[PDB]
């Protein structure tokens, strides 16, 4: 029943990485740098 310690630790590491990746998909206030 439940996660094994390896399963839970791997899920936590993958969760941290995925959350940073999703945070990095955000746009800075100037990202659409439109040329004239």
Partner 1 sequence: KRLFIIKPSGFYDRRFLKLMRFYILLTGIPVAIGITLVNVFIGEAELADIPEGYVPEHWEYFKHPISRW
Give the footprint of partner 1 on this chain (CB under 8 A): 25-27, 31
Find out whether 4 and 12 touch, Cβ atoms under 8 Å: no
Given the structure tokens 């100037």, which residue do they identify? 30
In angstroms, what is the minimal distance from the CB of 8 to partner 1?
A: 29
The alpha carbon of 29 is separated from its chain's Cα centroid by a whole number of angstroms, namely 20
Q: How far apart are the first and last CA of the chain?
A: 61
In angstroms, what is the minimal distance from the CB of 34 to partner 1?
A: 14
In angstroms, what is the minimal distance from the CB of 36 to partner 1?
A: 18
Q: Is 27 or 33 the residue whose CB approaches partner 1 more closely?
A: 27
């Amino acid at each position: 029943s439940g996660y094994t310690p390896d399963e839970k630790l791997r899920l936590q590491q993958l969760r941290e990485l995925r959350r940073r990746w999703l945070k990095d998909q955000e746009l800075s206030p100037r990202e659409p740098v439109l040329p004239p």
